[PDB]
Structures are given as C-alpha cells and as structure tokens.
C-alpha cells in the first residue's frame, strides 16, 4: 500500500494520457486499468483527486460508443460517487450531462451505472438538481419508466422525487412527459414494496400541484392508489392515503370507485388514528356533490362506520369534523338519503351529534354539525328525538351569539366581515336558521321555537344583505306562519313591509319564500 499512493500517483498522468489516445483500441486498455484503480483505497483517491483523470474518464464514456469501454468508464465514476470528494469531482468535470446521455444506453450495465451515480449526486451533491434538470434528465427518467427491472425503477422514481419536490418547473415537465400516467401504471402493476413506496412519494409530491392533480386523476390514480391500502407496509399505506386526500377534491367525477370507497369505509375501523383521520377526510371529499359515491358508501355500511368514528374520536376535532361532513353529504340529495337519515338515528347517532354543538367544540366542527342536523331533520322520525336532546335551544343560542357578533362588526372590526377560528359568523347565522327552518315543519318544534321568542330576530334577518340568510329566515317564518298565533306575532313585528319588498328579490328562493309567508298570513 506504501507504493499505491506513491506509484499510482505517478501512474495517474500515465493512464490519463492513454484515455485521450486517438487509437480506438488501446483507449479501451486504460479504461479497464482505470476502472481497477477505482477499487483500491489509494488509486480511488488518486484518480478522484486527479482532476485530469475525472475529466478524461467522463469525456471517454460519452464519446466511445464501444459497448465495452462505456461501462469501464461509467463504472469508474460510480465508485467515486461513494465519496464526497468523488461526487464533487464528478460534478466539476461535467459528468452529469454525460451520465444523463448514458441513460439512453442499450447496455443495461451502463444504464444502471448511470442512474445509480446520478442518484448519489442528487442525494449528496449540492447543485446536482440544477445540472440534471439542465441536461434534461427529467424527460429522460420519465421515458425510462417503461423498463421492467424493479430495483432500477425504484432508483429512477426516487430521483424524480428528489428533483420534483417543491419545484413546479420539474413538475410541469414531468406532466408534459406523460409522467402521471406512467407512475399510475407502476402502482397498478408491480408488488416490490420499495418501488411502490418510492413511486407513491413522487405522486404525493405531484398531487399538491394544480396541473398534475387532474392529470393523475384522469390517469386513474385514485383507483390505483386504492389497490395498496391493504398492503402490509405501513409507510406505503400512509403515503397512498396522503396522496389520495390531496387528489380527492378533484376526483368527484370518476367511475369504478366501488373498490376504493369500500376500502376507505373499512379503514375507519383501523387501530391507527392517522389512517382513520385520512380515511374520513377522503370520504368527505368523494361524497361531496357525487350522488353515485354517496349511494355506494351508504351501501357498504358507511353511515354506521362514520357514527362509530365520531364516537371513537371524542374531542379530536381533526377526526370528527370530516366524519361529520361526510355524514352531512350522505344525508341529502341522493336515492338513499332517507335511509341514511334513519340509519343515523338507528345507530344511536342523534345524541352524539347534538352534543357536538356544545363546548369544547370549536366553530368549524359546529358549522359542520349544524348542517348535518338540518339534513337529519328532513326525516320526520328524527324530529322528536332531535327535540328531546335539546337541539332547538342550542341552535337558537348559537344563532343569537353569531348574529350579535356580526352586529359588533357592522361598525368595523376590520372589513365587511372576517373570520373567527376560520369561520364567518354569517355562515353560522345561515346554518342555524336553515336548521330551524326544516325543524319547524313539526308542530311541537314550532311551539318550542316560538316559545324562545325568536320571531323578532327572524324578521330582522329579512333585512340581511346576505341573500341566503334572507332565504332561510323567510323559510322559517313561512313554516311558523301556519300557526295563527305565530302569524299574528310576525305581522305585529312589522314583517309585511319587508316581505313585500322581497317579492322583487333577484334570488328566486327568496322571492318564493317571501310570497309563501304572505299567502300563509293572508288566507287564515
């Protein structure tokens, strides 16, 4: 060894001379020796530290198409990339643009030497990201996703993950290169844990993108990610779940979701809190405005599973909020909505749902819960139970608070109206009044509502500048007007004047309810 870092050093200028030889026959001889001088502790640091070498070696690899020297050279750089000095040395000689050129090599051993070295550079060499992007490694790597060696694909997809992370430039190019569809293809074809994991990471990164999102969805990403939710690997399952939650708001138009939806429902009974949370989140977005998904979730026991999720979550609002939102979506506008409304009651959900209206619940959960209660009230069998649990007094109380807050802002807190815990009080005013409108279909509920002296407030809400509020207020007043005593109170309260003006509202809903109140009040 005492002559390695002494003779090889005096040998460096030697082989370096041969690598630049014009004779395409002996240049191969050095390539072999040089490669050998990459396996010894000394020779390695000899060439690696010999800028002259690195440069020639790199130039050789790319130039000589000789399917024999291409690997000796490529094989040299790779041995150097296991050392920081090597990575840096390779980076300075411009090896990256070369290595990227070799990604097109039909000689597997060269291909493998290229992708593994680039991976090392992208993993520990600052500046590598720019260079690879510069040389156009992105489109190259996306093209190589058509290969079938799984360890190779795992390396390649990891590189793409490194290059894409937090960079829309790379992401755009990946998209244009047809990356999404290729990535989804891998998820539905292979079973090599490491590969699925690394690929799910690239998808996770792209799923937070605006342009990549709808692309992954169209490629069938939802269904494919859904294939691995039952896999033994926890990191794979969790990565698929996060990516799925990100895509879920742009996948409300997909077909063949039966399998995914059924799996999500069963995932609600998981021992892992994090899986439960994501699952509820994903179901909430997939059942928003999609009657088909709503019918499916209900069909596989979604209602019972969600009520159980709410019970198990306790005071953990990151779980109850989306679970309660899903339940809201499932209890209206679809063929089985009525079955869903009944099932919530049959599975002992009414008590827990009304309790959520009380502290320690914060506003976002409260807002979601008021909406669910409005839907539950569409089922006449839920009126007495909802009333027994104290729903009306709490809804009215919430209504009064939110309305006053909007009054302490009619002056100037900041702007027209801002938020409180992420919720505008105008939405609580609308939600509560809307819940009371439906509940008021019941004669007994009307007695309670009227008894709390709400008519004066409801009338003032007709002057609200917010159309949706004017509409639910007129709505609840119309329901209450069917009782003579309430009808006289509404009139004594001066509702006729404002109702008469609302007949001209630009909002059909508002004009209709206003007119309905007046008719109910006329023909008594």
């Amino acid at each position: 060894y005492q002559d390695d870092a002494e003779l090889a050093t005096r040998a460096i200028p030697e082989l370096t001379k041969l690598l630049n030889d014009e004779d395409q026959v002996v240049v191969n001889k050095a390539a072999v020796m040089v490669h050998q001088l990459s396996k010894k502790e000394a020779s390695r640091h000899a060439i690696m530290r010999s800028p002259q070498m690195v440069s020639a070696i790199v130039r050789t690899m790319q130039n000589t198409n000789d399917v024999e020297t291409a690997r000796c050279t490529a094989g040299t750089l790779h041995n150097l990339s296991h050392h920081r000095e090597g990575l840096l040395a390779i980076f300075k000689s411009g090896g990256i643009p070369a290595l990227v050129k070799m990604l097109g090599s039909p000689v597997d051993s060269v291909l493998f030497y290229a992708i593994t070295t680039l991976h090392n550079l992208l993993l520990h060499q600052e500046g590598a990201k720019m260079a690879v992007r510069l040389a156009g490694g992105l489109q190259k790597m996306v093209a190589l996703l058509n290969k079938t060696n799984v360890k190779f694909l795992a390396i390649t997809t990891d590189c793409l993950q490194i290059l894409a992370y937090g960079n829309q430039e790379s992401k755009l190019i990946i998209l244009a290169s047809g990356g999404p569809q290729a990535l989804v293809n891998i998820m539905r074809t292979y079973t090599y844990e490491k590969l699925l994991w690394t690929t799910s990471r690239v998808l996770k990164v792209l799923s937070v993108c605006s342009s990549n999102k709808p692309a992954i969805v169209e490629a069938g990403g939802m269904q494919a990610l859904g294939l691995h939710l039952t896999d033994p690997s926890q990191r794979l399952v969790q990565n698929c779940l996060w990516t799925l939650r990100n895509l879920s708001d742009a996948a409300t138009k997909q077909e063949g979701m039966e399998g995914l939806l059924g799996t999500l429902v069963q995932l609600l009974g998981s021992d892992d809190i994090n899986v439960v949370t994501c699952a509820a989140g994903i179901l909430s977005n997939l059942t928003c405005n999609n009657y088909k998904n709503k019918m499916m979730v209900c069909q596989v026991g979604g209602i019972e599973a969600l009520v159980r999720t709410v019970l198990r979550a306790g005071d953990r609002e990151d779980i109850t909020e989306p679970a309660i939102c899903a339940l809201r979506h499932l209890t209206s506008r679809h063929q089985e909505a009525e079955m869903a409304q009944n099932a919530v009651r049959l599975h002992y959900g009414l008590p827990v749902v009304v309790k959520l209206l009380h502290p320690p619940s914060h506003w976002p959960l409260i807002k979601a819960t008021v909406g669910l209660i409005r839907n539950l009230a569409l089922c006449p069998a839920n009126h007495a139970p909802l009333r027994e649990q104290g729903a009306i007094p709490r809804l009215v109380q919430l209504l009064v608070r939110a309305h006053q807050d909007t009054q302490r802002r009619t002056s100037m807190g900041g702007t027209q109206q801002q938020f409180v815990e992420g919720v505008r009080m105008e939405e609580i005013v609308e939600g509560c009044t809307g819940a009371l409108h439906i509940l008021a279909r019941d004669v007994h509920n009307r007695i309670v509502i009227r008894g709390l002296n709400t008519i004066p407030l409801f009338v003032q809400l007709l002057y609200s500048p917010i159309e949706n509020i004017q509409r639910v207020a007129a709505g609840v007043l119309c329901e209450l007007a069917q009782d003579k005593e309430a009808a006289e109170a509404i009139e004594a309260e001066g509702a006729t004047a404002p109702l008469t003006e609302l007949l001209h509202s630009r909002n059909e809903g508002v004009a209709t309810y206003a007119a309905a109140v007046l008719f109910r009040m006329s023909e008594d």
């Binding site: 690997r71 597997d108 493998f112 060696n149 360890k151 795992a154 390396i155």
Partner: peptide, 17 residues
C-alpha cells in the same frame, strides 16, 4: 462474472434498506 444487476442490488442496499 458479476451480474450487472448487483450494481442496483448493492446501491439499494445502502441508500435506503
């Protein structure tokens, strides 16, 4: 002698698991 697939197998062995 050595299968040009050991290059990947080895790499994977060190970068991750």
């Amino acid at each position: 002698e050595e299968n040009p697939e050991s290059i990947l197998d080895e790499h994977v062995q060190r970068v991750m698991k």
